[PDB]
Structures are given as C-alpha cells and as structure tokens.
Design a protein around this ligand. Structure first.
Ligand code: 8K9
Ligand code: ZN
Length: 288
C-alpha cells in the first residue's frame, strides 16, 4: 500500500496533516543531542575510547562493562565528572517531539540516549522507551534493597569524587543505564510489539540505523508505514530511498535541528517551535 503521495519532506508533511496519520513513533540517537554539547560518545569515530588511557583499564570497553564497573567503579565516575555538561538544554529536535506530544501525534519516542534531554523537554515516562536506560535515576545494585537516588544526588557524588554508595546497605549505586553485559529493558521488547502495530509514521532522527536496536525495529514495522530519516549521514534497517521500487522511505540529509525546523515550517509549526525552544531555554536559564 502507498501512503505517501510523494517521497519528499513536503509529502511527509502532507501525510502528517491528513486524517490517516494519527500515531507517530520517533526513533532517536546521539545525533539529536550533539547540538546540546553532548557529543556522540557511542560511535567509534568520536574517539572517547582513546581518552581512557589514564584509567589503566584492561581494555577500553571495560569502562562500560558491568562486572568491571562493580569491582572498579572509580573510572566510570571519574569519566562522568570529566564530561558532565554545564547545562542540560534540549535541542530544537527535542522540542519538535514535545510538539508531537502536545498535538496528540506522538505514540512513543524510542531513544538510544541516556542524557535525559527528552524528559527535560517535557516527554513523560509513558511517551518514552529508554532503550539504553537513563542517568535520570540511579539505584543501589542490591536486589533486596534497590534504594532509588535522583540525578541531583548522583551529580553531587560525581562532583565530590565520592563513589555512590547506598545509605542503607552500603552497596554500589549505579545510574539506570544499560551497561555492557546487561540486557535491554523489558519495557523495550513489550512496547515494541504493540506500538509497531498501531504506528502510522516512523520519524528516525540522529541515528544511522547501521546499529542495534533500531536496525531491527525499523525492519519489522508494517510494510506500508512511511519512514522519514533526518540525519547528517545516510542510513542499515533495509530502507529504500533511491531505487525504482522506493515507495515509502524519505531521507533529509543535514543537522537534526535544521531538518526539524524545515519539517515544522511545512506543517506551519515553525513559529510555535521557535517560541517553545526560546521559552523553555529561558525557563532552564532562570532555574539553573
Ligand atoms: C554525565 C553526563 C551525561 C549524563 C550527559 C552523559 C551523557 C552521555 C554519556 O555517554 C553516552 C554513551 O554513548 C552511552 N552508552 C551507554 C551504554 C554503554 C556505552 C555508552 C554504549 C556504547 C555503545 C552502545 C551502547 O548501547 N552503549 C550503552 C555519559 C557517560 C557517563 C556514560 C560517559 C560517556 C554521561
Ligand atoms: Zn541499598
């Protein structure tokens, strides 16, 4: 089935404004947070895994490996102190997703990011699937305790260079991120099944799809679901933008903010979006 009239941003805009497009899923990666001064720590190109020499790890990946972390948590928290941002300011792209929520178009945002910016932008727990977890909350690692700690507590521990320990049972306190050797959250697998039935549009932003878990996700949405990619680079996932058989996939190449602004324009949301970014940034400035 053919749902987009044309395989262009204009066509996607037009589809979004039609009665057909009720439920949008966003899939978002590190590219939506780069313009917030969170660089893409994941992808190898960034070279994060070269600044780790001073932590004398057995191998660079050890800094994110759960068993290593439990024995030697100090490098992870030192790194966190090193790279902790001055402010947490969500990007235009984040606020575009806020618009989708408030217009009742957002079914779900699946995010690879742990930076909490979606939450700060006003996306709620129901709206979000944090595929790699989050720094927003932390928990004592003991299964009989699991004392919860807010980011404010974790930040203080990070800045004081005191290893987070549970006030109750003395166990290590770990940010709710998915370390190497830990499994994806159950939430991820459960929401996927149900969501990928009801979805009318996939908005894929700041991820190359060459990389799990979005590579798989994309390939098992219904065949007729239109998919728009907004990314600096070209897309895995089994997308088809270019062939004579292309029917549903659209690529916008450039920065995520600029792509979102362009899409907002066509929807007639540009002013609303620019105003929201300005207002929410000012609010953050006032309370920071
Ligand atoms: C404190 C500043 C803050 C919250 C703003 C921030 C933000 C991002 C941060 O890191 C982003 C990483 O890309 C998150 N990844 C989470 C885990 C382990 C690593 C790293 C990884 C690599 C490749 C695939 C993959 O799935 N995963 C999952 C980090 C740190 C602390 C973890 C220091 C690097 C902190
Ligand atoms: Zn505890």
């Amino acid at each position: 089935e053919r749902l987009l009239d044309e395989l262009t941003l204009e066509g996607v805009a037009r589809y979004m404004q039609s009665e057909r497009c009720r439920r949008v899923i966003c899939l978002v990666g590190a590219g939506i947070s780069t313009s917030a001064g969170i660089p893409d720590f994941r992808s190898p190109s960034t070279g994060l895994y070269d600044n780790l020499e001073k932590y004398h790890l057995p191998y660079p990946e050890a800094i994110f490996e759960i068993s290593y972390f439990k024995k030697h948590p100090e490098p992870f928290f030192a790194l966190a102190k090193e790279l902790y941002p001055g402010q947490f300011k969500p990007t235009i792209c984040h606020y575009f997703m806020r618009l989708l929520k408030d217009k009742g178009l957002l079914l779900r945002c699946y995010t690879q990011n742990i930076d909490t910016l979606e939450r700060i932008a006003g996306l709620e727990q129901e709206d979000l699937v944090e595929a790699h977890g989050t720094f927003y909350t932390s928990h004592c690692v003991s299964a009989s305790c699991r004392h919860e700690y807010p980011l404010s507590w974790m930040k203080e521990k990070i800045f004081s260079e005191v290893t987070p320990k549970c006030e109750d049972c003395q166990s290590l306190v770990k940010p709710d991120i998915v370390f190497f050797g830990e499994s994806l959250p159950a939430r991820f697998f459960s929401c996927m099944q149900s969501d990928f039935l009801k979805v009318d549009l996939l908005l894929v932003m700041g991820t190359s799809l060459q990389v799990q878990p979005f590579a798989s996700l994309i390939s098992k949405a219904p065949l007729s679901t239109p998919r728009l990619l907004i990314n600096k680079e070209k897309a895995g996932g089994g997308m088809d933008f270019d062939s004579k058989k292309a029917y549903r996939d659209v690529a916008w190449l450039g920065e995520c903010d600029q792509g979102c602004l362009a899409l907002a324009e066509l929807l007639g949301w540009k002013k609303e979006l620019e105003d929201l970014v300005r207002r929410e940034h000012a609010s953050i400035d006032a309370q920071s």
